[PDB]
Amino acid sequence: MNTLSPRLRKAMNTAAWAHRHHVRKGGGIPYVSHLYSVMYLLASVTNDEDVLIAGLLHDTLEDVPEEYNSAQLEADFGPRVRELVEELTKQPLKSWKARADAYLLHLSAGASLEAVLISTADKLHNLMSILDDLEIHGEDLWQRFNAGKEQQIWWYSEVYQISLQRLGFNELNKQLGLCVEKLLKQSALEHHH
Amino acid sequence: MNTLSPRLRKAMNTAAWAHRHHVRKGGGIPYVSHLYSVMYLLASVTNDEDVLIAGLLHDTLEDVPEEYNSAQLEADFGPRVRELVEELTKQPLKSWKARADAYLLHLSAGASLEAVLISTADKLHNLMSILDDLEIHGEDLWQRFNAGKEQQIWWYSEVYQISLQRLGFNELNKQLGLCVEKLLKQS
Numbered sequence: 455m456n457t458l459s460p461r462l463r464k465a466m467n468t469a470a471w472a473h474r475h476h477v478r479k480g481g482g483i484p485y486v487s488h489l490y491s492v493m494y495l496l497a498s499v500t501n502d503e504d505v506l507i508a509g510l511l512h513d514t515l516e517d518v519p520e521e522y523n524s525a526q527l528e529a530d531f532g533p534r535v536r537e538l539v540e541e542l543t544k545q546p547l548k549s550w551k552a553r554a555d556a557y558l559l560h561l562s563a564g565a566s567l568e569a570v571l572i573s574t575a576d577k578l579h580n581l582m583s584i585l586d587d588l589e590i591h592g593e594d595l596w597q598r599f600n601a602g603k604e605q606q607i608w609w610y611s612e613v614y615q616i617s618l619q620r621l622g623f624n625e626l627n628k629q630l631g632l633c634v635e636k637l638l639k640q641s642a643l644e645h646h647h
Numbered sequence: 648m649n650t651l652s653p654r655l656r657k658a659m660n661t662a663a664w665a666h667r668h669h670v671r672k673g674g675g676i677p678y679v680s681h682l683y684s685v686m687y688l689l690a691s692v693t694n695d696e697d698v699l700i701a702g703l704l705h706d707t708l709e710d711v712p713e714e715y716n717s718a719q720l721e722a723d724f725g726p727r728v729r730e731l732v733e734e735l736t737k738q739p740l741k742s743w744k745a746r747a748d749a750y751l752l753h754l755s756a757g758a759s760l761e762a763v764l765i766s767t768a769d770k771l772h773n774l775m776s777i778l779d780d781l782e783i784h785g786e787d788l789w790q791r792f793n794a795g796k797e798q799q800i801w802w803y804s805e806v807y808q809i810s811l812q813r814l815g816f817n818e819l820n821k822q823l824g825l826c827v828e829k830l831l832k833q834s
């Protein structure tokens with residue numbers, strides 16, 4: 455497990471700071487809970503501090519660029535961390551499915567193995583959170599999201615297949631696959647009613 | 648290394664929410680950065696989920712009890728996690744040295760080994776943060792705290808020695824000792 459170095463402490467502080475008034479969609483839980491969960495998941499599978507730092511700051515440029523920009527990111531953590539975070543950026547397309555399609559194509563060919571790993575921890579924590587919220591809110595939960603039940607099932611299963619083809623059976627892929635099969639039992643439970 | 652279970656995810660969310668308007672002394676960094684750092688340090692030394700959960704929520708009752716109280720804590724995470732967090736309660740004394748003295752006496756005899764471990768991760772992250780700020784701001788930083796340089800050196804070295812006598816050597820103890828020697832070389 456990586457030690458909490460001054461550079462890793464600085465990244466924890468920066469992620470909490472940049473996302474200080476950022477809250478997760480659907481509730482009042484501060485967004486940093488997701489960023490540290492992603493870092494914690496990555497810590498179990500990598501010893502590369504740049505990967506833990508890019509996991510902490512992967513959403514800064516897309517969600518809070520007014521608080522923390524790419525020049526700030528590079529001056530604080532170097533160009534490899536900036537490159538890592540910038541590989542996960544979306545194509546500026548109107549359509550959700552056109553953005554998802556391009557991200558998936560990049561993940562299968564183009565994205566580095568480190569960017570695929572960060573993306574796997576990110577999607578795994580997002581699916582873990584959806585599963586938690588399904589137990590609380592049921593089938594009514596899909597309203598707070600930009601893509602419905604069948605689009606979500608497609609998204610997570612495609613991310614899982616691509617992640618498994620690129621990285622193999624690591625701890626994040628063993629867990630993401632388990633989550634995908636749980637999401638399918640929840641769609642089965644919805645239809646069973 | 649513990650898996651991110653639904654109960655551990657709930658504790659991460661609860662710690663971030665309860666401390667959403669809580670900031671670390673001296674700046675604008677949200678306090679959850681410290682709570683998460685303490686949990687991360689504990690994860691390297693324990694597989695007891697109650698200890699990781701008490702590390703995440705150790706400051707809720709003392710710093711933000713209006714957001715999260717002991718009944719909420721027990722209903723969400725059980726009475727063992729509540730007991731763990733309540734062992735790390737600092738007595739309400741007007742003197743800093745009277746508050747420190749009582750905490751140290753409890754840590755050496757009374758506190759459970761799990762509470763001693765949480766306290767070690769907490770003090771280690773606090774000293775890591777002070778050392779980081781000393782490299783940035785220099786000697787003028789000693790004015791910022793409620794206890795001066797010599798009182799801080801006493802505090803961290805006493806916590807380190809008590810922690811060693813109770814737990815033996817562990818990764819947290821070791822790192823805390825390294826931090827205490829850094830604090831001394833800069834004096």
Ligand SMILES: [Mg+2]
Pocket residue numbers: 488512513576
């Ligand atoms: Mg994310």
Ligand SMILES: [Mg+2]
Pocket residue numbers: 681705706769
């Ligand atoms: Mg503390």
